Paper text:
The second principal receptor for [name], [name], is a type II transmembrane glycoprotein with a C-type lectin-like domain (CTLD)4 (3, 4). In its membrane-bound form, [name] consists of three CTLD “heads” connected to the membrane via a trimeric α-helical coiled-coil “stalk”. The interaction between [name] and [name] is critical in the regulation of [name] synthesis, which can be up- or down-regulated depending on the oligomerization state of [name] (2, 9, 10). We have determined the crystal structures of the human lectin-like head domain of [name] in its [name]+-free and [name]+-bound forms, as well as the crystal structure of the [name]+-bound head domain of [name] in complex with a subfragment of [name]-Fc consisting of the dimer of Cϵ3 and Cϵ4 domains (Fcϵ3-4).
The [name]+-bound [name]-Fcϵ3-4 complex crystallized in essentially the same crystal form as the previously reported [name]+-free complex, but with a 2% increase in the length of the c-axis. The six heavy chains of Fcϵ3-4 (labeled A–F) are bound to six [name] molecules (labeled G–L). Fcϵ3-4 is in a very “closed” conformation when bound to [name]. The angle between the Cϵ3 and Cϵ4 domains in the [name]+-bound [name]-Fcϵ3-4 complex differ by only 5°, similar to the range observed in the [name]+-free complex structure. This closed conformation allosterically precludes binding to FcϵRI. Each of the six [name] molecules has a [name]+ ion bound at the principal binding site; the electron density for the ion is clear in four of the molecules but is ambiguous in copies H and K. Comparison of the [name] molecules from the [name]+-free and [name]+-bound complexes shows that the only substantial difference involves residues Ser-256 and Glu-257 of loop 4, for which no electron density was observed in the [name]+-free complex. In contrast, electron density is observed for the entire loop, including residues Ser-256 and Glu-257, in all six copies of [name] in the [name]+-bound complex. All four salt bridges and two of the four additional hydrogen bonds observed in the [name]+-free complex are retained in the [name]+-bound complex; the two hydrogen bonds lost are between Ser-254 ([name]) and Arg-440 (Fcϵ3-4). Arg-440, in the Cϵ3-Cϵ4 linker region, is key to these additional interactions with Asp-227 (loop 1) and Asp-258 (loop 4) following [name]+-induced ordering and conformational change in loop 4.
Residue numbers in the entry:
A (entry chain A): 335 to 386, 389 to 545
B (entry chain G): 158 to 292
C (entry chain B): 336 to 361, 365 to 545
D (entry chain H): 158 to 290
The structure:
């Protein structure tokens, strides 16, 4: 038994950084003493750019190829394919990816902060709820001192469907007293296709203002 | 100095050359085709330009060089130019989404926004025609 | 063919005092056989089978076994065995109480600001965090009555920066609910929550 | 009356019989064992009762009939009685979690809370001694 994955670029990389990449991730549920051959191909037959393996903490090999794509190329509807030459499945793997074509909706941003819990005076947890957007592709970021907090620092759920047509995520961010006793304002950013202008919706959030 | 020289298989009109390609292509695949033919998808700017194309336009429908950077919400020709001339069919653009960040031309020459992954049997390229020194 | 086995809901266990576990297996000649057995070798109660066809030509069949309250808490290991014509070597799933450190959940509950073009509806949010183990039951309340499970949606427990876990729950609400009685309770049943295995936060739409 | 009669392989003390089982078992598997033997996990109530048991306790450690309903936080003997007599080893119960909702007895006769999924090599059962008329 064995699966593989191919992930669209990050709204951030695409719309803002303007250098989107897709990644083909293959999870091997038991690695054999051979190589894996991740091959890239465009549905047009145009040349793919040059693309960019790890032992997991349970003896499973996880190898990921990061192919950088064209900004315009992607947005216009180019289909990208991942062909993985595996030594254990009778034939190959054909994972394929393209721009999700249908309705738009701009995301709703909400940022809160947790009330004080006794014995944790030095830290608080800020929540952000980003909802009613579509398609599911969205990038979520936290800001301070008008520089962006690194990715590890917070944790954002996989987009789930809402009761209606939208999608929603929550982002959770623990902050030290040092941080909010410098500038007591933290911005929750969401880069989404439908968000205008400049593909951005953001809320600002204060620990007891 | 007169401009009407076209390379073979290109039909001229005023100062541009026009190629009317055929084959099931998506919009972006329609885009590629014209680059490889050293032109670009068509950019319609004059009602006269539209009249000329309407008479060569596939009745199945054609792909034209109109779409948006998304980071817009506004349509723009593949040459970079804005929309001065428009030939919108009734009800169209249904855009704001929908969808349908790509503009297609019906048999009637009328424009309508259809999805980009949608496949159509024809597309129209253009390029600048070349000219001839005076004597 | 994968196979799965889920612990009871802390609500069934701690409050309802009638916990159930479920063996879920995600298809041809359906001679499927879900077998139940205790690691002690003691007799298991009678379980509830139901097979269902999914909206992609996959069969999803689940067996729900009811367990002893005390017996579960005290550490009994329950097992699920499956034998089948389209299966090579029988799948054997086991479940037991997660035996580890405990931490009671921190509950916080919000109602979302008014959105332009959406007057008669709001969205309530509930963050439950810093608890362990991950097993946790989330519920929403209104006028003595517990809101139906479909009404809200709660995330799979993710690890926190520290040692605990966190879940979020999301709840869309009508004007007639809050104008009637503008109080909505977010309730957590968790193992470590004292007294009587409950933590809850009350939240009002514009209090 | 006089009560000191025990069924075979059971050791007597005061008005009760005690079985010192041996075998790798978890706390609840150790509880089962005692049921099958028509007794229950041991419930210690007097310093003399503990002193008796200390002499027969395996070095490896032993399972005793003390735990909680969780819907407590407070330990209770499998016979239903609360804790009147206690023989906690120092810094124990480490409970309040941790976890360790089950109590074991050391070689020393001292008690310590250990996790219930841990497997120990001995357990002690009890039952009421029978009487000679
Ligand atoms: Ca349309
Ligand atoms: Ca201890």
């Amino acid at each position: 038994g064995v699966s593989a994955y191919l992930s669209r670029p990050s709204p951030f990389d695409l719309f803002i950084r303007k250098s989107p990449t897709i990644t083909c991730l293959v999870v091997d549920l038991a690695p054999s003493k051979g190589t894996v051959q991740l091959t890239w191909s465009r549905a047009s037959g145009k040349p793919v750019q040059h693309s960019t393996e790890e032992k997991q903490r349970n003896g499973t090999l996880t190898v990921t190829s990061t192919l950088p794509v064209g900004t315009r190329d992607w947005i216009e509807g180019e289909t990208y394919q991942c062909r993985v030459t595996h030594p254990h499945l009778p034939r190959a793997l054909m994972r394929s990816t393209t721009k999700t074509s249908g309705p738009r909706a701009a995301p709703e941003v909400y940022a809160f902060a947790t009330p004080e819990w006794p014995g944790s005076r030095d830290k608080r947890t800020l929540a952000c709820l980003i909802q009613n957007f579509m398609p599911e592709d969205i990038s979520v970021q936290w800001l301070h001192n008008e520089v962006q907090l690194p990715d590890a620092r917070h944790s954002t759920t996989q987009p789930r469907k809402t009761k209606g047509s939208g999608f929603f995520v929550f982002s959770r961010l623990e902050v030290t007293r040092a941080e909010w006793e410098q500038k007591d304002e933290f911005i929750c950013r969401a880069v989404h296709e439908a968000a205008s202008p400049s593909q951005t919706v953001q809320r600002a959030v204060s620990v007891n203002p | 100095f007169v401009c009407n020289t076209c390379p073979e298989k290109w039909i001229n009109f005023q100062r541009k050359c026009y190629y009317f390609g055929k084959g099931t292509k998506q919009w972006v695949h329609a885009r590629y085709a014209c680059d490889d033919m050293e032109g670009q998808l068509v950019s319609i700017h004059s009602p006269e330009e539209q009249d000329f194309l309407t008479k060569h336009a596939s009745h199945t429908g054609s792909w034209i060089g109109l779409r948006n950077l998304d980071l817009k919400g506004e349509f723009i020709w593949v040459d970079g130019s804005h929309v001065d001339y428009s030939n919108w069919a009734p009800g169209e653009p249904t855009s704001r989404s929908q969808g349908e960040d790509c503009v297609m031309m019906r048999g009637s020459g009328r424009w309508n926004d259809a999805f980009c992954d949608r496949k159509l049997g024809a597309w129209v390229c253009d390029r600048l025609a070349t000219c001839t020194p005076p004597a």
